[PDB]
Paper text:
Type-IIa receptor protein tyrosine phosphatases (RPTPs) and neurexins are the two major presynaptic organizers. SALM family proteins have five isoforms (SALM1–[name]). We determined the crystal structures of apo-[name] ([name]–Ig), and [name]δ (Ig1–Ig3)–SALM2 ([name]–Ig) and [name]δ (Ig1–Fn1)–[name] ([name]–Ig) complexes at 3.08, 3.16, and 4.18 Å resolutions, respectively.
In the apo-[name] structure, the electron density of the Ig domain was mostly invisible, probably owing to the structural disorder. The electron densities of the Ig domains of SALM2 and [name] became relatively clear upon binding to [name]δ, suggesting that the Ig domains of SALM2 and [name] were partly stabilized by the interaction with [name]δ. The theoretical molar masses of the monomeric SALM2 and [name] [name]–Ig-His6 molecules are 40.2 and 41.2 kDa, whereas the molar masses of the SALM2 and [name] [name]–Ig-His6 molecules determined by SEC-MALS are 77.0 and 77.1 kDa, respectively, indicating that both SALM2 and [name] form homodimers in solution. To evaluate the importance of the residues involved in hydrogen bonding in the central dimer interface, the N158A and Q134N mutants of [name] were analyzed by SEC-MALS. The majorities of the N158A and Q134N mutants behaved as monomers with the determined molar masses of 55.8 and 49.1 kDa, respectively. This result indicates that the hydrogen bonds in the central region of the dimer interface are critical for the dimer formation of [name] and also confirms the dimerization property of [name] in solution.
Residue numbers in the entry:
A (entry chain A), B (entry chain A): 19 to 223, 227 to 291
The structure:
Amino acid sequence: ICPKRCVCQILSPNLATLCAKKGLLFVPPNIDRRTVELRLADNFVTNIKRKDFANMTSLVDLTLSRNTISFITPHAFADLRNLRALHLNSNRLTKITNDMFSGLSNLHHLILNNNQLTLISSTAFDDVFALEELDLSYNNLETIPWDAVEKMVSLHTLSLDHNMIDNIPKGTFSHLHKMTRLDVTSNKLQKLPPDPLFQRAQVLAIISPSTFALSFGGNPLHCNCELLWLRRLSREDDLETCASPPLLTGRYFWSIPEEEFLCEPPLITR
Amino acid sequence: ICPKRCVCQILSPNLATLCAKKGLLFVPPNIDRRTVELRLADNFVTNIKRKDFANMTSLVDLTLSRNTISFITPHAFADLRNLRALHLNSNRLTKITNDMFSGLSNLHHLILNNNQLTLISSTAFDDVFALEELDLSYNNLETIPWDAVEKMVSLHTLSLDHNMIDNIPKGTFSHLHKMTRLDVTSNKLQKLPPDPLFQRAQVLAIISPSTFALSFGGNPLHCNCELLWLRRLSREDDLETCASPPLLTGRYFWSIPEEEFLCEPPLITR
Ligand SMILES: *[C@@H]1O[C@H](CO)[C@@H](O[C@@H]2O[C@H](CO)[C@@H](O)[C@H](O)[C@H]2NC(C)=O)[C@H](O)[C@H]1NC(C)=O
Ligand SMILES: *[C@@H]1O[C@H](CO)[C@@H](O[C@@H]2O[C@H](CO)[C@@H](O)[C@H](O)[C@H]2NC(C)=O)[C@H](O)[C@H]1NC(C)=O
């Protein structure tokens, strides 16, 4: 049942298959299909085939953390109907196809951090709409399918720090009431959309603790009146820095008074 | 002299310019050119220009660790004649041009780990021939200019783990007598060249400690008689794993007896 290297243990009624730190180069063939937890972390798997995780209906937690995974066969996660958590962090993934995460309705946690992700095809998140956590940190992403993200009502954590994200839609986080943490540090963002969740990121006074936590440091901010709503907020200085206008270039976001966040009236050239 | 954010300190006769964790987006303009140590680590610099480190002749240690650096202007390190240590780890670098590291004769330590390096043009290491440490770990490299490496006699540390290196020349490490550590873990190596330095990686008996330390785990080894020289060595099991022949696929490198490492005689087809 349990592969030679793996230490599969049994606790009624669940079956766990522990194959972490075993120097594996590929996913072991004879893993019991009625396994519930499967740890394949800290190995050297380079690619996944359909035959690996096929037929595993009872699987609820899969861990492929810290591998050399660069490609996974389309429809290899298709039969994981009861999977709730997937760890694909610290690999060599490049793209996110639609066939990759298909049928993962019960998926609540999806982790893709420390990968070299460049593109995420739309509708790739059209089956994981009911997740609660999404970690896409430390990637080469500049855009994500926000439309599929807007359909994630039960989402409470969105990790996006250390990417190259250009901008972010204004209509997002509208019905995402359960959101409690958003990290967009070290991205190439020019501005930020206003939202009541961000109003909930203050420390105010009785005294009150911040119930929402956002991070927007390390961004080429365009310090105009379109960010004035965020400057009016009362938050701790997180070393944020303006990049433009040239007069505000270099000075801290919180070191600049509200009367210096200005915009420019429209005029007609021809 | 010292930039607004930076904390430049003076100890006779050296001048250090400390600008770490200041939320910088670019290298500050007015850094004193007669600085000796310059810490720009933990910021958000995206690209380097010639005007940044130009004219800094007295600089002996430059630290650009953990930035968003993706491109550096050719001949931007040209005038760093007295530079001995360079830290470019944890960035977004892709390529290593010849103009990049030109004239760095006195460079003894070069660190490029945790970058997305794909290619290293030859002759890029034709000026750093007198270095002592080279960290190219955690990159997408498959080949490096070995010819330029062979001219590094005073080299004692070569970090190459977690890449995609295909193979490695047999004539290397010939005159590199000062070599004391080589890490080639998590690479796509099929085999390994024999070397007296590897004979110095044993624990033998009086009792003796290993004076050389090499690591070759996480590699698709081709367990034939061409690796039999390494199997005959007496070393600690580092979870190494064979990938071929198919009969030896999956079994540990050290769990296989020496009599099973076989090769195949030549025959003529036509
Ligand atoms: C997935 O499950 C099926 C059974 O549910 C496995 O067994 C058979 O697969 C062969 C294919 O060569 C079919 O001809 C049989 O009809 C299947 N059996 C039954 C009872 O339907 C199949 O091998 C499993 N596949 C993998 C990749 O594990
Ligand atoms: C590098 O050093 C030179 C001086 O060694 C700096 O000063 C002058 O640069 C201008 C260029 O517009 C020349 O016309 C002058 O002849 C230079 N002065 C001398 C005394 O030669 C130069 O600005 C420095 N460059 C940078 C980028 O810092």
